[PDB]
Enzyme design. Sequence first.
Site, PDB file in Angstrom:
ATOM      1  N   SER B  47       0.823  -1.253   0.000  1.00 19.29           N
ATOM      2  CA  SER B  47       0.000   0.000   0.000  1.00 19.29           C
ATOM      3  C   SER B  47       0.848   1.292   0.000  1.00 19.29           C
ATOM      4  CB  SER B  47      -1.032   0.023   1.105  1.00 19.29           C
ATOM      5  OG  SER B  47      -2.009  -0.986   0.910  1.00 19.29           O
ATOM      6  N   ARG B 227       4.965  -0.536  13.454  1.00 18.99           N
ATOM      7  CA  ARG B 227       5.502   0.274  12.319  1.00 18.99           C
ATOM      8  C   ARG B 227       5.709   1.728  12.807  1.00 18.99           C
ATOM      9  NH1 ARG B 227       0.956  -1.234   7.921  1.00 18.99           N
ATOM     10  NH2 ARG B 227      -0.245  -0.689   9.766  1.00 18.99           N
TER      11      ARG B 227
END
Lengths: 241, 242
Positions: B47, B227
């Site tokens: 993405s 993340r």
Amino acid sequence: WQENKSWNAHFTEHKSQGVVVLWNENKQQGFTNNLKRANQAFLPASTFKIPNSLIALDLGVVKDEHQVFKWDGQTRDIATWNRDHNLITAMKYSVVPVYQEFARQIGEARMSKMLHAFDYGNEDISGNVDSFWLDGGIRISATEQISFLRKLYHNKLHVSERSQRIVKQAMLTEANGDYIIRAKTGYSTRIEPKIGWWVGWVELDDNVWFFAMNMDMPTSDGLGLRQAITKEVLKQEKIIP
Amino acid sequence: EWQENKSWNAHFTEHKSQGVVVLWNENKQQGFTNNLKRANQAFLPASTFKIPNSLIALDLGVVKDEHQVFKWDGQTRDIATWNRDHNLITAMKYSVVPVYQEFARQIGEARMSKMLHAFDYGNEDISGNVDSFWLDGGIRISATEQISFLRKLYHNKLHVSERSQRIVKQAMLTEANGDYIIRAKTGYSTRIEPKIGWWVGWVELDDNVWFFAMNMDMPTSDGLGLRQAITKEVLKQEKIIP
């Protein structure tokens, strides 16, 4: 238009008086704690940096948001003013001497013609070309601030799409996973009555809420209440968590 | 020019994970990483490809502006936020794959390949299905190649209009306060081994910009919050954010 007096509690809690105005863009409905004060016209003080920025970009006085405006070397009472700035930092720290130099380069004739084209408040720039928004003849109400900000949000003002996108970037105040706030503070101290402003909007996933508030501000001690009282109203109405 | 700081490995081993963070100081033109080899290894963008796909769709007029509505196709999918109408802003925020697959079919193979060559984007290879190549085809990019691309976007130097670049930087907005602004995009690659998570973007300060790109091993979806959390631990250690 509908009047919600329960918001007066948020003012009473701090021994303060003022107005909050909200506009629901999807439903085209307005809400306020005080319908008369919502339509009372005051000096805009640093909320004028929104139209001043648009005009300076559209005329090429400001080339882009990275152009540096060097400090003139005069030590002033606000520490953040005594350094180099660009459009983003000059908005953020409300740097009056940078905006005074923009107004001098725009000039009386172009300033007056642009404010008529924007339908801005009483459209009257009488006074110094570089101080009329602080101590001259210009006046605007909370409901007239929302009308002006709605045109800016939809790119409907009579300046380029580019000028409107850059100013909306400079207005960025807060963002997270729940909401974005684009807004500008003001503090009118030169002419009575002394008042504080906060004007702008809240972007959600599937709506926008426009706001304009002003409050009595006899000293600088209360300046943090401009954002704090507005957020208490937005939480009460379930607009933000 | 480039310096290795192995002390950052403590932020990965704290969470029994493995990965790379890459930082670039725009004012000083200097880079920093915990792993010089992994910083230059190529992976599926997943993405993170929504950044170039958005730029191409806007520049070709497949997307008119950030307000245009993409109606749900009425096929019930796994992710509840995908089963509703979107614009560019919400499609980026919720990583709505089906919206971007329709953009890619309308762009087509020839225009998609020409634009990735113009951007110098990773290995520039779109081999596979036009509507899934960034998830399971031939395209690959490294953390250092992500920074090179994002630097061009920040400076409006990509070969698309200034308008297209300004709208995509608006759609990337993630966090803002009185200390900093973060513009960025998440990724999660699961169709090809090894399974990894990405976070790429930059931090705007009053007088500098710090570019970042990180990837990490992601054996289950349970670690996805690391993340952002591991990246922010590195930014705090280096005194970039409070």
